[PDB]
Amino acid sequence: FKQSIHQLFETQVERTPEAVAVLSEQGQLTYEELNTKANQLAHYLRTLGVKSETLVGVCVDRSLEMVIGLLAILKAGGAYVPLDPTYPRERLTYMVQDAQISVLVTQTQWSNLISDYQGQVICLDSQWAKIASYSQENLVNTVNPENLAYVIYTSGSTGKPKGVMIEHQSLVNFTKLAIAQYQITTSDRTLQFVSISFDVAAEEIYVTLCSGATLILRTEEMISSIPSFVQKSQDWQITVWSLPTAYWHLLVNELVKSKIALPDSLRLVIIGGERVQPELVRMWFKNVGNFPELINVYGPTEGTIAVSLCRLSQLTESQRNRTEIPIGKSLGENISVYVLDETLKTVPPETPGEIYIGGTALARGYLNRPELTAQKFIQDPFSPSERLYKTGDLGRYLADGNLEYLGRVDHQVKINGFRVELGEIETVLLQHHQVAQAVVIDRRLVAYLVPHSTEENLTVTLQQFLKNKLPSYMIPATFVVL
C-alpha cells in the first residue's frame, strides 16, 4: 500500500474539507483551501522543473505560507530543504551550493539571503496573483515512496553541516505510527512550536494535518515568557503541546515557582530532544499529576524524527524515583531499536551498549557524504537486506523492557535545544589566523584556545568571526587562553 505524505494529507482533505487545517494570529485555512493553494503552487513549481528528487530550498517564516510551501513542494514531487533565515549568509549559501538547489520558495523579506543566487526564486508574499492562476487540482503520480521528502541539515564535526535525506516512506510510517500512539483526532489542536530546521516540526505538522486536527502556529513573542506561553495556549484551547525538553524544564520551574494553571484544554505534552531531569519529572508529577499525559520521545534525525517513546504519566512511583527516566520502547513493530556491543551483537538485559536503529525509520543517508554515510549507516551483518544506524547514543534495556539513555560516545551535544557538534565549532575557530589549536566543551559552551598572537579583544573578535559562519547557539559565551 504505497503512499506519500501528501497523499495521506489529501485523503484527510477529502474526508473533512471544511475543517480548519491551520490557524495563526493572522488568519486561517480550511483543509480544502490549504490543499487548493498548495496545489496551485505545486503546479507552478512543476513548470519550474521541480520533479521527483529535486531539492527545493525553503526560507519562509512561520506562517500559513510556510505550510502551503511545504505541502506544495511535496505535491510537485520535490524534497524540501529548510533554510533557516536566522543563520548567517555564508552558512545558507553553503547549503544551497551543497544541495544544488535551483528553486527557492521564500518571501520578499528574505531576498538577499543567498549570495550569488542564480536559480529560480518564488516569493509567496508578492507573487500570489500569479500562483492563483495555476490549477487547484491534486497532481497525480509525481513521486514514489522511496523518493525524498526532505533534506534537513545538521551540525557536522568535520566543519560544515550535512543534509539528512528522508524518504516519503519513512516519514509516512512515522506519521501513521505517531497519530495512533498519540491518539490524535479531528478535535485536537496542536501548537506548532519548533522551527522547520528541526525534524520535530514535521511531527507537529504532518501528525496534525494527516489526522484532521488543527495546526496552530505560534508567534516568537509567545515563548519568551512561560506565563504568556500558557495563557496564549489557553486562549487558543491547545490540546497538544510539543516541547523541546529544555523548554519543558523551564516550564516546570515556572509552573511551581508561580501558581500557574495549565490550560484546561491541554491533554498531551510531548517532550524530547535531550535527557529529561528526573527531579523535574518528580516535580511535574507532584504539582500537575497525571493529566495532561506526558510523553518522552527519543530519536535522531537520521531515524526520521523518533523511534521510541515512554509514557511518563504511566510510570510507577518507583520507576520515576530512578536516576534515569526511560526513553521507552519502539514506536512500532517495523522500527528496531537495538542496544548492541562492538561486534553488533545484542546484549543481555540491563547491559549497556550502543544504540542502533533498524527498519523503516532509517534515512536514506547523508547528502554528498559517502564516507560518513558508510560509517553511520551500516549493513546489518545478521540481516543482509537491511541497515543499522549507529546513533552514537549509549543505552540499556531494563528488565521491564524499557530503554534507558546513558549518554554519548562522542562530542555531539545539545545547546539550548539544538544539536551541536563540538568539533564543528573547534574546526571553524582553527581557520582563524590567531588560533593555533582549540577545544570547545560543554557546559554552556566554553572555548579553550592557544593563540598565535593574543590581544585583549580576542573574545569579541572570535565571536564576530563565528557570527558570520555558525548559528548563534554554536557561539561560545566564554573563551579561555594559555
Ligand X SMILES: Nc1ncnc2c1ncn2[C@@H]1O[C@H](COP(=O)(O)OC(=O)[C@@H](N)Cc2ccc(O)cc2)[C@@H](O)[C@H]1O
Residues that bind ligand X (CB under 6 A): 199-200, 203, 242, 270, 272-275, 296-301, 305-306, 327, 391, 393, 405, 419
393 in a known ligand binding site:
yes
269 in a known ligand binding site:
no
Contact 136, 340 (CB under 8 A): no
DSSP H helix total and E strand total for the chain:
14, 26
Q: How far is the CB of 68 from ligand X (least distance, A)?
A: 23
Q: How far is the CB of 390 from ligand X (least distance, A)?
A: 10
Identify the helix (H) or strand (E) that includes residue 481.
Answer: strand 478-481
Closest CA to 91 of 63, 57, 128: 57
By 3-state DSSP, what share of the chain in percent is helix, strand and coil, each rounded to 5? 30, 25, 40
DSSP one-letter string for 452-473: SS--TTHHHHHHHHHHTTS-GG
Q: How far is the CB of 482 from ligand X (least distance, A)?
A: 32
Is the Cβ of residue 61 or residue 302 nearer to ligand X in the bound state? Answer: 302
Identify the helix (H) or strand (E) that includes residue 233.
Answer: helix 226-235
Q: How far is CA 98 from CA 101, 151, 199, 345, in A?
A: 8, 11, 19, 36
Helices 5-15/31-47 angle, 10° precision:
140
The closest residue (CB) to ligand X is 272
Is the Cβ of residue 56 or residue 152 nearer to ligand X in the bound state? Answer: 152
414 in a known ligand binding site:
yes
Q: Measured in whole angstroms, how far is the alpha carbon of residue 27 from the centre of its chain?
A: 25
In angstroms, the CA 426 to CA 126 distance is 41
419 in a known ligand binding site:
yes
Residues in the chain: 482
Q: How far is the CB of 298 from ligand X (least distance, A)?
A: 4
3-state SS class at 285? helix
Is the Cβ of residue 34 or residue 327 nearer to ligand X in the bound state? Answer: 327
Q: How far is the CB of 53 from ligand X (least distance, A)?
A: 23
Q: Measured in whole angstroms, how far is the alpha carbon of residue 236 from the centre of its chain?
A: 23
Write b or e for each residue in 156-189: b if 16 or more Cβ atoms lie within 10 A of its Cβ, otherwise e.
bbebbbbbbbbbbbbbbbbbbbbbebbebeeebb
Structure-block grid coordinates of residue 219? 508567534
Is the Cβ of residue 78 or residue 300 nearer to ligand X in the bound state? Answer: 300
Q: How far is the CB of 393 from ligand X (least distance, A)?
A: 5
Is the Cβ of residue 57 or residue 299 nearer to ligand X in the bound state? Answer: 299
Q: What residues pair up with 104 in beta bridges, in sequence order?
A: 57, 121
Is the Cβ of residue 213 or residue 462 nearer to ligand X in the bound state? Answer: 213
Q: How far is the CB of 91 from ligand X (least distance, A)?
A: 17
Q: How far is the CB of 346 from ligand X (least distance, A)?
A: 19
Q: How far is CA 407 from CA 71, 343, 356, 413, 439, in A?
A: 36, 20, 14, 10, 20
Is the Cβ of residue 56 or residue 200 nearer to ligand X in the bound state? Answer: 200
Is the Cβ of residue 202 or residue 435 nearer to ligand X in the bound state? Answer: 202
Q: How far is the CB of 16 from ligand X (least distance, A)?
A: 24
Please count the CA atoms within 13 angstroms of the CA of 133 that sit on its side-chain side: 4
DSSP one-letter string for 319-347: HHSSSS---BEESSTTEEEEEE-TTS-B-
Is the Cβ of residue 122 or residue 367 nearer to ligand X in the bound state? Answer: 367
Identify the helix (H) or strand (E) that includes residue 264.
Answer: none
Residues flagged as binding site: 199, 273, 296-297, 301, 393, 414, 419
Residues flagged as binding site for AMP: 273, 296-297, 301, 393, 414, 419
